[PDB]
A paper describes a structure:
ZIKV is a mosquito-transmitted flavivirus first isolated in 1947 from the Zika forest of Uganda1 that has recently emerged and spread to over 30 countries in the Americas affecting millions of people. Each E and M protein pair form a dimer, with the E–M dimers lying parallel to each other to form a herringbone-like raft comprised of a total of six E and six M, with 30 such rafts covering the virus surface. Flavivirus E protein is involved in receptor binding, attachment, and virus fusion during cell entry. The ectodomain of E protein contains three domains: DI, DII, and DIII, followed by an α-helical stem region that lies on the viral membrane with three stem helices (EH1, E-H2, and E-H3)10,12 and a C-terminal transmembrane region containing two transmembrane helices (E-T1 and E-T2).
ZIKV (MR-766, Uganda strain) was grown in Vero-E6 cells, purified, and vitrified for the data collection on the Pennsylvania State University Titan Krios. The final map reached 3.4 Å after postprocessing. Our structure improved in resolution to 3.4 Å, and we discovered two distinct lipid moieties coordinated by M and E helices that have not previously been described. Surprisingly, an unfilled density was observed arising from the inner leaflet and stretching down between the M and E helices positioned such that there was one unfilled density per each E–M protein heterodimer. Due to the absence of the lipid in virus propagated in mosquito cells, we compared the pocket structures between our map and that of PDB ID 5IZ710. Alanine substitutions of M residues T57A and S58A did not affect virus production, while alanine substitution of E-protein residues (F449A, F453A, H446A, W474A, and F497A) were lethal for ZIKV. Only mammalian cell-cultured ZIKV incorporated the crooked lipid into the hydrophobic pocket arising from the inner leaflet.
Numbering used by the authors:
A (entry chain E), B (entry chain C): 1 to 501
C (entry chain F), D (entry chain D): 1 to 75
Amino acid sequence: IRCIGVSNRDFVEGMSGGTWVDVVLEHGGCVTVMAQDKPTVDIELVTTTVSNMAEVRSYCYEASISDMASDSRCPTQGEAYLDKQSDTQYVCKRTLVDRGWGNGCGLFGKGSLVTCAKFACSKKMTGKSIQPENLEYRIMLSVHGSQHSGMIVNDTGYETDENRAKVEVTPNSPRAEATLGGFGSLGLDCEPRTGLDFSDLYYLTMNNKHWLVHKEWFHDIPLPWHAGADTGTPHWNNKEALVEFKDAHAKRQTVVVLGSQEGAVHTALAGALEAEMDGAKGKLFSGHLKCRLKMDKLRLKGVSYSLCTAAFTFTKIPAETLHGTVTVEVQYAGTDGPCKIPVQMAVDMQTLTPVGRLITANPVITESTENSKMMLELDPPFGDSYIVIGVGDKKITHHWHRSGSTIGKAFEATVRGAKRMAVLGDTAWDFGSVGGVFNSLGKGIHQIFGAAFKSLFGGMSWFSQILIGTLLVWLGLNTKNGSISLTCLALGGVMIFLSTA
Amino acid sequence: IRCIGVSNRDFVEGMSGGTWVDVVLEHGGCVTVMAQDKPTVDIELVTTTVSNMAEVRSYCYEASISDMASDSRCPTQGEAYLDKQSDTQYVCKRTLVDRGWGNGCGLFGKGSLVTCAKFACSKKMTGKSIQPENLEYRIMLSVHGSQHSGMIVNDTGYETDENRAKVEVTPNSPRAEATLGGFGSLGLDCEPRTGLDFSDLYYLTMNNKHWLVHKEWFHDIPLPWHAGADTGTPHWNNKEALVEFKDAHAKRQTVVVLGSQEGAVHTALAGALEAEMDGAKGKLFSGHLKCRLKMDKLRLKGVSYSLCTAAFTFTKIPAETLHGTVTVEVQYAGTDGPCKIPVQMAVDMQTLTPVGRLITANPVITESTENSKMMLELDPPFGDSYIVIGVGDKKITHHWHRSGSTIGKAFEATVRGAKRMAVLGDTAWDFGSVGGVFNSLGKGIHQIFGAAFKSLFGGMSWFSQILIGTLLVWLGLNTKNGSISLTCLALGGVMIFLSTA
Amino acid sequence: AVTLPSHSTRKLQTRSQTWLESREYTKHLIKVENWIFRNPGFTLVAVAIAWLLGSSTSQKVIYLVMILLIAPAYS
Amino acid sequence: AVTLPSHSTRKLQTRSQTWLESREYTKHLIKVENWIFRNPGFTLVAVAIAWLLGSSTSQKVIYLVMILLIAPAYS
């Protein structure tokens, strides 16, 4: 439920004796945390809301010049001067023009010419700063249990459902607990400060389109900027980055403004996360949290129930959810009340030996009317097998064939882990970890390599990474020495880092 | 007159026995053609008018998307389809989104999603082609003679002046003759087809600012273009160069348009000649003509006049016109009528030996009133000297000191010629030429080198020319072989070609 | 102005799409191919400079590649 | 629209200056110095590769220059 159709779901199984497990919730990726004896809960980070942002600059990407004037002095008579030259709204430029007896002067030579022109800006983009005491991650939870198909993305009603509960995690209140009625309460000891590193991100805003630009990039744009939250007539430092003074040859100097740089900066971002805004708060939809799941009071509701009698019936013939797991929906015809579904999977039906585990732990029927639907999820074995749902002779069966192999499983999981390590980087060592001398020492070594790599290369794009990766792999296949593994690991860390995007 | 204050004047002296001389009139540069016994005439190319241009493309640099729709199919159910997908006004894109039991489907997997969006363009730039039977160069002439200061740039009245006459030279009528009353008529055997090579130039037009873009550049812009002179609703081939389809992760695909590329193309020209337009004709103000001056009926008016008696007086104390030449304005107090001014320059006034030539040939007073002003132009010798204007004892004198040296003269002229050769290129061998086995064979060798250099490098900017020039000069100072003068002449032809701009 | 700095250097690496992702692979290749197709004469100049600067037959190839990349972008 | 081809290759040579000629000498130097200033460690990783490639002493310097020119343009 809530995570059964997602194409980027990860299963985190196993804890430290039932205490807790670390997870890294990403935007767009779901996490299914199945424990030993506890209900399977689905955790998903939905939004990241940045609030109370204060602006720093405002670049002017489309200007216009009003009345322009000029003044000229004869040669060897000083240099020109306009009254509107001491005005900080006029962009001016002085140059030397040829001056002679025909131009009304009295001496041949290079004169002097000053051209003023009023700078008035029409459109501008504001960049607001993000402080990490403003992030507020929202986490939606969902337990596998008394829920049918109409419970997966159906968000209409959670706090009256016993199965769905949202949790808002702020760096002011990092640990929050979700109340799942009957199942207990899952505890989340989040890390809402070490998220997407909002100490070097801004919030661009250009014509009702907001981005998440880097601070260094935002401080290097060559456009006329002013100091802050000015809504009146700003000062516009660096006006000369949009006007262009052209002298033809003679006593003439034309001033023309460059057009609207909106498109020129749209194609200049090309790496920035697109965000949105719902008023004063900026709602991001990309990033990641780092969460620890205290699962000690998540209890299994319905372990003392009685089995079902009979009359199960398949509705919505089972399906395969991109990972092998099977989503079965049943319909118990009976009035037993809160009973327990006797589901299992079996090779040849004589012995009924169980062969596959069950993703939804302890399925249970709670609705006591005669037609009570319920949705399971199994994890079949590789090869053909049967899905037995019931006891006695009125049990229903369904032939299932899970195409694949354990070697394919292992390679798929390795590719998954490599992508997670290329995306998250250092925090990828805290995804299923329970603590140790490997998932805590390897993280240190990976952190050292990550700092020494993001500070060394740290500034190349996809194409340049491919280029220097080929160069380094060729320096590895030649120049036989001890510094060859060094120029081949720096081929891997540059091809898989990009070339898995 | 008309060319005395210009900072880029060139003196062309000497012909083939009085027959003709070749000149290359540029925009912004004047030519003073002094002959042996003929009046000094000043030729200047003022405008180049291209008419009757027919457009080829129209790129759309600012678009907008109206109503957008979408459609989705369940997995293994085909792919999506919109009714507005067969419409050639809608830009669409198909992608696969995750689909499951929560999204209303019945099977887990990658679905199919098509997003249409109506493309409506608001602004566009038109590129018109230039045919060399449309150029019409206008050439303004002016003879040194009965003209005072109020005759230099004063264009109010030429065809009633005997001294100023405009000539319009079309490739339909290349040779035209200017009527200068009393002086005869100067003949111009122009070359209006081998001008600025208008077979590879277009006429951009973007928001009332016109340029002269190269054809190759104009055919490579990545923007939605249509076929021609469509004023209604065009077809807009290649719409997908301004829209951007973004899928978040789920069954969602947003379409956003990039902003106005006006500034992005303004900073992308950066090498194009800015032109103007006065209606349907495009008036350029940069280029060059190639003219031959048939001077056989340019006669010297006033060679049979009688000398002046006395009473000359300096008005507008002489000046130096950036080249050494001296512009003297006198005021003959007398009623002699059409007399002749006895001007000369002399070292120590005992012998009155003439030392400098006279730029204005045979100065003459024509006005017969008592206060008739007239403007000369001399070319003093290096050092101090006197300007004697008159005969007898009522002659006026003026001390003049021309600072310089003949070596400075020669180096200045060499720099002038080098700049002309870097700008005009091949045609720089036809600037004062009268024919020969040097000014006609050297032009062939220079033409060969020019073709083999504009086809070899031909595509580098100022910075890259500097770069490869340093690289080649360093390959010259090393790698001792016969191919070292080859990599040093290709250092000169790349530093002086640019690094004299 | 004319020196707008690209953000692809500092692109934010997340699970989601960046601003212009589909247009980021075939961009520099498009520019290089366009410039080379427009100015074919410079290929032999790059060849003649690489095949004269390099000593081994695999430093000449690297020099040719780096020149044919420096040219279409002008540093 | 992300690959607007620069027209400074086909520069029309005349007496008058072209469209943006004042803003043309310091256009690439600024783009290179901003990148070298924002990413200094690449100076070291470029010196390393130049020294590992160039057999001569005036060959590794050329490799270093060409790497520091190719990097801040990514093409």
